[PDB]
Structure formats: structure tokens, C-alpha cells
């Protein structure tokens, strides 16, 4: 397995966020590497290639792209997969909910990846326990929780709620490698999720989003 136990840093500034920049994301990933991260989440082929220039950490690649008439935006179709194959990231991740996709179904997209990029591992971005089970059924190499609370049917939910109850349920329903992702904001939460038995945790905003860290300081004053 490409991803060792440990901390993954997500370096995925989108257009219109302050640090949107292949170049800046390559230096964020260099910082995460120097601080002891064991991998990187990255978005778009161009950011993946920039990152692969500054670090040798295995990278988890997505392409975030909206399609009309679909709620699936994380590596929705084989178009995004083909970009990621050219990028040579070690792990291709994709929304592995069962919401309607623009083109291939999720089943078909998994088969597509195994067919055309047999050397790459796959990772399932999921929002629910049933989705996690289905991803295990599809043979995903890793199962992440980034979509928990970020779908229309999980509004309100936060990974940490009720002492990480959702994560507990996920770990008990599958035997696949489970990745805690989404609002892991303190070293203490990170410790907690590793204690609960996840393989890795992914941290984004608490490391690579100074706007969001800034807002957390400023709001104690409200």
C-alpha cells in the first residue's frame, strides 16, 4: 500500500480561494513533507505535477469539476480520471456516493480505473456507512469520510460529533483502510481518530488555509 499510517495534508486551493496556485500548492506540500506528512491530497493534473516537483510523497489526485444535472463533482467521469492517469498520482480518489453521475456509473468508473490504470490505487470519498460498505464491496484501497456532512442527505453532520460516532460506525462496517477526513482541526482530534483505528487522517484547512485558521482566532473575540 502506497499510503503509510499517518498524516495526509490536503493542498487543494480552488479558484477564488486566497492561495489558488499550482506553485503555492507545491510549496504547501513541501512544508507538509518537512513537518512529517506521509502523503498529499491534490486537485487537478497541473497542481499534482507541480507538487510532484517539490516532494516524493505519494499523492491522492482528484479533479473537482461540476456537471449540470449531477451532484457529483469529485472525479465525476472518465474525463477527470484520464486527467489523473496522465498526472501519475499514486492514488486516484473519487466521490463514491451512489448519487447519479454525468456519464459512467460509479461501478463502471471503478472498472474503468482498474482497466486503464492498473498500477494506481483507488480511494473512495464517502458520506455514509452504506456508501463505505459499497466501496469495500467495489474493492477500494482506501475509504475516506470527506463527504460526510457535504451531501444533501447529510446536512448538519460533522465527523467529530458525538465523539466521532460516524467514524466508529464506518470502522466497524468495513475491513478496508479507513481515512478520517473533514474538520479534523486540532492535534487532539488527529490523536483521537488514530486511536479509533483509522489508517490515516487528512488535514486541510487546519494546515493549508490561513484564511480559515485566521477566522478561528478572530471569532473568539465574537
Curated annotation (Swiss-Prot):
The lineage of its organism: Bacteria, Bacillati, Bacillota, Bacilli, Bacillales. Pfam families: NanE (PF04131). One of its GO terms (cellular component) is cytosol. GO terms for molecular function: N-acylglucosamine-6-phosphate 2-epimerase activity. InterPro entries: Aldolase_TIM, NanE, RibuloseP-bd_barrel. CDD domains: NanE (cd04729). GO terms for biological process: carbohydrate metabolic process; N-acetylmannosamine catabolic process; N-acetylneuraminate catabolic process. Its EC number is 5.1.3.9. Converts N-acetylmannosamine-6-phosphate (ManNAc-6-P) to N-acetylglucosamine-6-phosphate (GlcNAc-6-P). Belongs to the NanE family. It catalyses: an N-acyl-D-glucosamine 6-phosphate = an N-acyl-D-mannosamine 6-phosphate. The keyword Phosphoprotein does not apply. Coiled coil: none annotated. Pathway: Amino-sugar metabolism; N-acetylneuraminate degradation; D-fructose 6-phosphate from N-acetylneuraminate: step 3/5. It comes from Staphylococcus aureus (strain N315). This is Putative N-acetylmannosamine-6-phosphate 2-epimerase. It is an enzyme of class 5 (isomerase).
